Amino acid sequence: DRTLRRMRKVVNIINAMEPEMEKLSDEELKGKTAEFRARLAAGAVLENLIPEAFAVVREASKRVFGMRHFDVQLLGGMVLNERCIAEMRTGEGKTLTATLPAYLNALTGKGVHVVTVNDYLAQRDAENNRPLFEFLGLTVGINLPGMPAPAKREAYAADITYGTNNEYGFDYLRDNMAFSPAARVQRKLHYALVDEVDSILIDEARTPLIISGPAEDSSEMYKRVNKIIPHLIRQEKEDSETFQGEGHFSVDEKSRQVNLTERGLVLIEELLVKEGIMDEGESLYSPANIMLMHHVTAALRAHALFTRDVDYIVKDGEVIIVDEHTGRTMQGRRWSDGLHQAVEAKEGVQIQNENQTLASITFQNYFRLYEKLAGMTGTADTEAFEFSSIYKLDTVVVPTNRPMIRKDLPDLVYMTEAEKIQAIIEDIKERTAKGQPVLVGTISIEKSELVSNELTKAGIKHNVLNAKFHANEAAIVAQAGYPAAVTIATNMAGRGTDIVLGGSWQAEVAALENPTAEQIEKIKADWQVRHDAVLEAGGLHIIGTERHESRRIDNQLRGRSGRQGDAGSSRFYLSM
Ligand SMILES: Nc1ncnc2c1ncn2[C@@H]1O[C@H](COP(=O)(O)OP(=O)(O)O)[C@@H](O)[C@H]1O
Ligand SMILES: [Mg+2]
């Protein structure tokens, strides 16, 4: 690869500038953003400033985080500034790496969109990265579902923004429906730096974002027409040859249907016309005005055939149905032909127009809108062809910082699921006994629960991450490399949270309240022994309970082991 060779020369140069950066004060270092922007206003192009800008970020990260960008992270940063994907293995530091191109592009003053995969990660990377960006004179926004338009607009106004693919695309659709540009929230789609880019740009590429709403706004007919039914009096039978009534409508409890007598049609017609929904002399069976017939026949049914606390209930301002078994109440179900609306309208609660698609976009089309697009992932090379053909993104495999020595053992076949699950359990117990921790990836909650319950029978304490409380599960995952830890996770659970061998001592320190030097030195000295032992015991061991249809997904699982040169192993189990 010739591209890596050109970029190595810049890495060395950036390295050559470190001594001069170390002399700058925190204020001289902070002024760098303004010195760069003046250059840009006086003839510089962004690419000229790449060395200098990266060296400023690195040295800033030294002082703020205690983290000096590795050479390979400098390489990935340069990739990310071109229209490319940087494949950087799990735990190669993609979050810190992204600060290089995000700093560089934010100088342009047009904003930067960092995309992660879920809301917990967007806020985490923003807040983790925020001290480095504020140290350098930049602001950092966080776009989250449920934020009001002013707050979102402030987050898009910041130098750099974080958010999920869903909420960025939802903002754009909502922006396309604005009546003038003033209501919008986004600026121009300038730079989209997409974390976990195979999840986002490939797996969700074709899945569309949809905003549903009503255009058939026919509530005033429902509400107003409802006013007429209280005026109608009920009678026991239809006005037959043998029977006569003094009322406006009847009812078939047996056949569950409503019949209207001629005087009611008079009065309804009178009242329909009267309030201002009809005309004099109009036939209400008239093909001309037959919307009302459905309005009235639904309204009439709503009062006549359906009764509250019997067929439905009115909790939380939603008309809810009740199953004939009287057992339960559905929460998504509605009623056809305007029946629910009339029923809702009779109770007065929340008239529900029909909802339809009002705006739609695929992430494919969406992320193609940005002027600059880039992406990082631990697993991209296999998808290189659609990255190029769909987005014109080129992929670049980035050397790991240290040598990758994880041992991906051969798969194992068994005749039946029972046997596979007994063999995994036997292997868990074995590796626990030695102190080695084990992460068990599944591809479904169903398979997580089955495995969990076999681990329980076997007396094996373990944790189950189902990807429903990302922040909580993130806290469990960070300890999953504790000696003899046992964690179950579906492919979607706890991704993006480093699993440190021996546990994360960071977590331990926060647990204590105002610790002291030798208390913390206690944690640190204890953790090192844990880490040396776990590393000695083979590190983290991955068990795949089955292989995904897409091998890349299995590759993401095993990648959770073997970070930054650590020992580790993985193994997938198969059966019929
Ligand atoms: N240059 C660095 N020096 C020290 N630690 C780093 C550096 N870069 C990243 N880290 C640490 O590595 C851990 C994993 O980084 P992360 O961004 O989660 O990896 P990835 O997203 O690439 O899988 C984090 O705890 C982070 O603080
Ligand atoms: Mg990550």
Author numbering: 15 to 590
Excerpt from the paper describing this PDB structure:
To obtain a structure of the E. coli PPXD, we used a deletion construct, “SecA-N68” that lacks the C-terminal domains, including the Helical Wing Domain (HWD), the Helical Scaffold Domain (HSD), and a linker connected to the Zinc Binding Domain (ZBD). To obtain crystals of SecA-N68, we removed unstructured regions at the N- and C-termini so that the construct included residues 15 to 590, which we term “SecA-N68∆NC”. In addition, entropy-reducing mutations to alanine37 were introduced in two areas, one containing E55, K56, and E58, and a second at E196 and E197. In addition, removal of the termini allowed us to obtain crystals of SecA-N68 that diffracted to 2.6 Å resolution and yielded a structure that includes both the DEAD Motor domains and the preprotein crosslinking domain (PPXD), which was disordered in the original E. coli SecA structure. The structure of SecA-N68∆NC bound to Mg2+-ADP contains the DEAD Motor domains, NBD1 and NBD2, in the same conformation observed for other SecA structures, with the exception of the E. coli SecA structure which was crystallized in the absence of bound nucleotide and in which NBD1 and NBD2 adopt a more open conformation. The β-hairpin anchoring the PPXD to NBD1 is in a fully extended conformation that has not been observed in previous crystal structures, where the hairpin is typically bent to facilitate interaction of the PPXD with the C-terminal helical domains. The core PPXD structures are conserved throughout, with some differences in loop regions. Helix 4 is particularly well-conserved, likely because it plays a central role, interacting directly with SecYEG as well as Helix 1, 3, and Hairpin 2. That is, SecA-N68∆NC, in which both N- and C-termini had been truncated to remove unstructured polypeptide but is otherwise identical to SecA-N68, is completely monomeric when analyzed by gel filtration chromatography. Formation of the SecA-N68 tetramer is completely dependent on unstructured polypeptide at the N- and C-termini.
The bacterial General Secretory System is centred around two essential components: the SecYEG complex, which forms a pore through the cytoplasmic membrane, and SecA, an ATPase that couples ATP binding and hydrolysis to translocation of an unfolded preprotein substrate through the SecYEG pore. Attempts to address this question have been confounded by the fact that SecA exists as a dimer in solution, but given the changes in SecA oligomerization required for its interaction with SecYEG, it is not clear whether the solution dimer is related to oligomeric species that may participate in the translocation reaction. Truncation of E. coli SecA at residue 610 produces a construct, SecA-N68, that is monomeric at low concentrations but at higher concentrations forms tetramers. In the current work, we have discovered that the formation of the SecA-N68 tetramer is completely dependent on unstructured polypeptide segments at its N- and C-termini.
